[model samples]
Target chain A: NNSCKKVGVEELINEKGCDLMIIRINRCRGHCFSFTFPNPLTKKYSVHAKCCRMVEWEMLETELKCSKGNRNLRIPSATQCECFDCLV
Target chain B: GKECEFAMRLVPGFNPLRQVDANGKECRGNVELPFCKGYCKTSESGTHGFPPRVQNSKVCTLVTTSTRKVVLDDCDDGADESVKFVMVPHGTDCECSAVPLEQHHS
Candidate 1:
């Protein structure tokens, strides 16, 4: 079954720089179902699409030590996930 | 209007409001009505570039709809007033959604 939930994944921040920071963070991962049908009002077919996305997110602040002073970084971390429409 | 964003907007060569008969088989409507039409953003999920990572596929689809009242053209056979109020669905909202990886390819 498809579901929207939080999954822990390893992410590398600042890959090009000397400070290679690897952190484990939760990300929204899943699949959403889409249905295509004719509209009774217009007889036009429309696709009702759903997507797995982040519902709640927070900033993950971490400090990494490099050749110089400690570098502080804030990363966008997914706290909760849900199946919802991807609106613009 | 949030121009250049992933939102519902009218495009050229398409009417923001369109007319259709009750049976929806009319070549043209006696009266012009409103409807929704346009394109949106969609993307596939995959790993790319250096330091590959997981990505999710997104699908742009209709999210909301509304109805408009219009008179049917040539309703009940050749009567001029043969048209009455007809409801038709119009797209109100659209968005990008994530689908399963398998479905994304298919």
Candidate 2:
């Protein structure tokens, strides 16, 4: 069956691999319905494909503090997932 | 916030979809397709202050679809009989989804 769901990432890292905060984020995972058919009008084949992706998301607030300064940031996170038509 | 309805509408609205084939052939009649439209629950959690830090946004979209045979009238673009009949997708159900990332730019 094809369905979309939220899954956690194993590890999220940046270029420096050094940070003051470690926040866990989620991603979308699943399968979608896909099919191909021959078009009689164009005499060619057409494909209908769907992809499992994030249907909804939220903003995660985090605070980073160091000896030098303090900063506040908002990180994007996926809260829900669903299938959608794939872009051509 | 608690009064928000986190469910899809039972009956869908029949919307007019233009009858156009993959080959850019336009027909005279438009097929009425059923689609769901509603609102879902969303709130700001974790931080409750003058300015909420964490926010959850939800949107309604079609989740399930079904196909039906639709015939168009006054079509003269193609000679094949198959062009007159089309297999169109109609919305059957809906669900609450999050806003896509690309939409943030706009």
Candidate 3:
């Protein structure tokens, strides 16, 4: 069954560089999931969808609606591979 | 009455807003507004953001005119106000500047 291999969390606190860590999970299904990360510096929150099945464009559009989400970021102009693990 | 005048400023180079119409179709030539931003993705999970956290809603398929054939998401979320002109694959220029469309607003 297709499921999340692992969950990685990255936190950028204060002036220090961002910290990244991962969590392993077992017995999971392919479905929609959301994760919340709190910013220790701004005390704000950031969220992301785990195992999103929508195309990259769709997932990006959904995430753009969230606060603190970067909207003006530029994307490549060419079509690349569609493989999840490889392309994404 | 004192004459009221409004002037429009133009940022030389390229703009994204001029590439497409309201329907998101790419339009060539110098445009009044500037390029807001562009997005592209292949798979659902494969999609990533430029800055990593930002998200966009506009999506388009790669056309012959486009540099690459990747799925595109050219959003007009009024975010162009923050876009900076830069050369990229699309082979287009986006202009940015303060412009006055209409003078009489009374």
Best by TM-score: 1
lDDT digits (tens) for residues A1-88 of candidate 2: 4566676754343424336356676766554444432222332333444556555677777665644565666655677666665441
- Global lDDT for candidate 3? 0.25
Best by DockQ: 1
The candidate 3 chain A region of ten consecutive residues with least summed lDDT is: A20-29
Range of the 10 consecutive residues with the lowest summed lDDT in candidate 2 chain B: B8-17
CA lDDT, candidate 2, residue A49: 41
Q: Residue-pair clashes per candidate, as listed?
A: 2, 2, 23
Q: TM per model?
A: 0.42, 0.36, 0.15
lDDT of 3 at B91: 24
Q: Give one digit per residue, the lDDT tens place, for model 3 in B29-59.
A: 3322112222222122232344432222112
Compute the lDDT for candidate 2. Answer: 0.47
Span of 10 residues, lowest total lDDT, candidate 2 chain A: A36-45
lDDT of 3 at B19: 37
RMSD of each: 13.1, 13.2, 22.4
lDDT of 1 by residue, A1-88 (tens): 3467677778776744448878877777665555443243334544555566666676667787666567766666677677776542
Residue B9, candidate 3: alpha-carbon lDDT = 25
lDDT of 2 by residue, B54-99 (tens): 4343444444356567676777586264456666444545455443
Judging by TM-score, tell me the better candidate of 1 and 2: 1
